[PDB]
Amino acid sequence: VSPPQVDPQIAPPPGTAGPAQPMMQRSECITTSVLPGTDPGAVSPNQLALNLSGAWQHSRGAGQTVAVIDTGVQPGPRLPNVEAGGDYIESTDGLTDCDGHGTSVAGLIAGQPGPDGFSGVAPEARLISIRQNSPRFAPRTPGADSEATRAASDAETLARAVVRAADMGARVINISLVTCLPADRTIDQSVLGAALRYAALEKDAVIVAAAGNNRGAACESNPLPSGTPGDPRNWNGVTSVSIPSWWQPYVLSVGAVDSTGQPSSFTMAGPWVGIAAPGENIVSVSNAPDGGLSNALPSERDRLVPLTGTSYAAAYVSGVAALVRSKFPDLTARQVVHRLTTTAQGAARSPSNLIGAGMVDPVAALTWD
Template identity: 50%
Template sequence: MFRLVSAVLAVACGVALGAGGAAADRPPPVVPGLMPPGPPMGPPEDTEQPANAPCVSTVPGGDGPAVPAAQRALNLDRAWQFSRGAGQLVAVIDTGVARHPRLPGLIGGGDFVSRSDGTEDCDGHGTAVAGVIAAAVVPGQGFAGVAPEATIVSIRQSSEFFQAKGRSQQKNPEDLPDGYGNTHTMAWAIRRAADMGATVINVSETTCPSGPLHDEDLGAALQYAAVEKNAVVVVAAGNNDVCRGTNPVQDPVDPAADPWSKVTMNVSPARYDQYALSVGSVDGNGQPSKFTVPGPWVGVAAPGENITSLDVNFADPNSRGTTGGFVKRGQQSAVSGTSFATPYVAGVAALVRARFPQLSALEVIQRIEATAHAPAEGWDPYLGYGTVDPVQALTAEVPNTLPAKRSGGAQSWQLPVPSAPPGADDTARNVALIGTGVIAVLLVLGYLASFPLRRRFGVRED
């Protein structure tokens, strides 16, 4: 995970720095007048990439015919019988998306970090996210994106390897870059994606600062994208390795309480769940990943551990390779996090939009939630309404409404005390015994009665 710093807060891919200590509130009412401005594109200030901050490299992995576990779990082969996401424009708001042969239609949507068109990715993160969504099917390769016929538009709004220009002169040579990107550039990027006609917007970045969240313009951008521009916005729930602290959500003493009343740490943009679908992560066994930040905003979950996706090969831009990990400053890490669960759901949203073009963005979200594999409680702060099911999302009939995001809590019932079992029916036995007894008595009486008769007729007994 990397840090993206502004004067207001810090943002990281998948989750943000800092953890709140005060009770969290529902997001403030959206004020349309706070909508961020449109063009011109570019960062709000000049930026730099320090010399001691080389871009990441990736670990080759996942090539060959074997289908990755996450892909098998979602049964994508069957889902593709109904939709492959054709005609859908999916915006990836992230660290940029590098051009890759398996993203043939990639569109550069702009850059709020530097002066590229959005198709430079020093971090590797955005390229991996885009690959999960829409990597093309290639003969002999098991890995492919969820919606392989969708088109990606890349908008770079964050990077760990950049900072405001001139900061290097104020720091020691060995100091790492501050990172660049915040909720304000995220808001601009969301508006940019919506104005470009994106039907799905993937945001695998969140923030959870220790102080107040000044994200009102982000809320306005989300409403604009989801309601006015009819774009399905899918966002990460966040990872607790950076959002440090507790966020219990459920109180075992009061399990049926409003989950918002138990939250101690806000996560944005996930908390704007009336406009965005927030995604948690599950492991290979379908259990909630230990790093998922729970919250009343979680809508669904998807595989988010040990993911395979497209690599960023700076030495060979024409590489068709895949990756299963990043190498940064000599340290290797797996492709894991709610950041990578999110694009699985964004890909499903693209499949649904292609199959059901008449559905609004919010109706698409409801369909995905209604067809997920629900936990026993009906809703869970780690899993939301359950693990996403692409096939069901494309084929099932769904209810008009969903239950509120509130766990059913522990319940108890007084089980009926079973009545005493009926006594054994001994009629047959009794009849047999009585009959036997009667016969025995008659035999004895007959035997005794035979003595006088024997004497009368002179029968001698030897």
């Protein structure tokens, strides 16, 4: 197991939308809800950890377009700033979210302030929603439904969606969904690699991906740095590949921290992790018809649980990237990634396989010389 490398003979795919085969909805749609006993309208400690108040004195993300490659984004009063980017599941415009996830992610990135303590990181940014996946759907033809087959199908649409996002003018491309494969069964991803390279270099997009959560295949943390000469981050020891995070250097892979900046218990360790952001007790926008604030989803036997995960951490980082690109519009994607990582809270330590350079620091990123 070694860091992946593009095959220069393999072209990026087209950005055509649509599923590879017809899909059918297998599970009822879900909306995010308010967890009883909470006050979602209070300013989240996650915002305070990031000092978004301080950041907004430098930038609110004006002029930036962020693509949300996710489960769709439901427009509403807190998300009036969402553009259709299409659908790889059905034939919608990307503005239907049957899962809640894309909406929560979009809200963190560029949700609007309102009559409460909630705001997106970059509320003056514009969003493009591309629905690239949904676990509520499966192929209409009930064929092989294996981890391998699902993962390959997911990579195939992800690569197209990345090209589509870049070609639609996205400056930041957010990939909060994660697919993992065991290392002994990771197949050629040359097309996905080609797509990510196209978007990151030729189209100069900052691509941000969630690192994954422990427990395709179930994601599992990889062994930590082990002092191997020439392999300080322990690529050699990887057993569980997080996609597209492992596609360094094109993708900034984001781990989750608690509100104090410590690695979240569930954050997936890997040698690709570059940075972190808050991933616990998330409050964002709902895909329910009112489009208000939510902070929970149903778990077993329909009991509500908080929103947690690296998906939300990635979203925060995408929002911060939009702030940085608005303030410094001439920086390349590589320069923007360098700025984010070199100013993160743990940048002066060797990178962590849990949190990379540590929790993103928006004000530091916006003021560093």
